[PDB]
Amino acid sequence: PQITLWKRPLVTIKIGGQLKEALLDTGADDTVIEEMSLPGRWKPKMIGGIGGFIKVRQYDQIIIEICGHKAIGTVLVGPTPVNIIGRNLLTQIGCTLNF
Amino acid sequence: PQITLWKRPLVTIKIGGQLKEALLDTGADDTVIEEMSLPGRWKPKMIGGIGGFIKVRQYDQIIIEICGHKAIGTVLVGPTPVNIIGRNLLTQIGCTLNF
Numbered sequence: 001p002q003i004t005l006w007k008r009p010l011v012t013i014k015i016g017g018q019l020k021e022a023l024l025d026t027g028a029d030d031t032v033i034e035e036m037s038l039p040g041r042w043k044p045k046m047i048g049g050i051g052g053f054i055k056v057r058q059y060d061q062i063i064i065e066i067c068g069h070k071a072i073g074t075v076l077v078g079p080t081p082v083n084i085i086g087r088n089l090l091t092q093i094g095c096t097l098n099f
Numbered sequence: 100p101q102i103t104l105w106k107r108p109l110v111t112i113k114i115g116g117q118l119k120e121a122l123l124d125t126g127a128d129d130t131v132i133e134e135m136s137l138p139g140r141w142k143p144k145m146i147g148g149i150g151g152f153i154k155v156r157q158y159d160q161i162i163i164e165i166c167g168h169k170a171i172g173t174v175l176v177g178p179t180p181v182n183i184i185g186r187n188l189l190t191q192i193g194c195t196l197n198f
């Protein structure tokens with residue numbers, strides 16, 4: 001698909017058996033999801049920018065379905081104000097910026 | 100151009116006759132640049148990031164060139180960690196997300 005940017009590019013995703021809304025963010029290196037349970041090992045990480053930093057749990061090798069496209073990668077879980085799909089997963093679905 | 104997301108989507112911008120590097124960010128509603136002098140009056144604005152809200156200065160109808168494409172619009176100035184081109188200007192240059 002082609003997504004315009006008149007409004008926030010929010011899409012439905014499937015992660016850990018749950019349907020969630022997430023923002024496609026070209027300006028995020030990593031994917032960050034609001035508090036939820038995920039399987040496997042995790043390690044702590046700090047991520048931040050505007051308004052400072054937050055502590056998150058880093059889970060590796062997590063499968064996500066974004067607009068019918070399956071992708072696998074690291075997912076950070078923590079107190080983010082919005083679910084964010086970062087470049088680590090946007091590359092896997094072949095997402096590009098065009099102008 | 101078509102920009103892939105294996106690296107951060109950093110481009111050259113020109114604002115106030117100066118070249119700067121900025122990130123194309125589909126996850127940002129607005130454009131925010133690091134401290135610099137802009138003409139005219141400014142208005143107060145709060146923007147929310149991953150860690151909370153920050154105060155910035157809102158300047159309107161500012162001329163800015165993004166990757167060679169001319170735009171004229173709102174530019175926020177504040178303590179952002181990187182210069183960010185948000186949807187207000189990405190729409191002006193005809194930027195879309197495609198997969």
Ligand SMILES: C[C@H]1CN(S(=O)(=O)c2ccccc2)[C@@H](CCc2c(F)cccc2NC(=O)CC(c2ccc(F)cc2)c2ccc(F)cc2)CN1
Pocket residue numbers: 008023025027028029047048049050051081082084122124126127128129130131146147148149150181183185
């Ligand atoms: C370059 C980084 C800079 N920041 S970040 O927080 O520092 C960060 C740094 C490292 C990792 C993750 C995030 C982000 C954009 C922030 C931003 C601007 F920069 C300029 C102008 C506006 C805004 N904010 C929004 O538009 C609100 C919006 C939002 C998106 C991401 C977010 F995290 C927090 C909030 C939103 C809120 C609620 C909701 F329901 C839906 C969407 C992402 N790109």
Ligand SMILES: [Cl-]
Pocket residue numbers: 072073074088089
């Ligand atoms: Cl990854």
Ligand SMILES: [Cl-]
Pocket residue numbers: 094103
């Ligand atoms: Cl590619």
Ligand SMILES: [Cl-]
Pocket residue numbers: 171172173187188
């Ligand atoms: Cl604008």
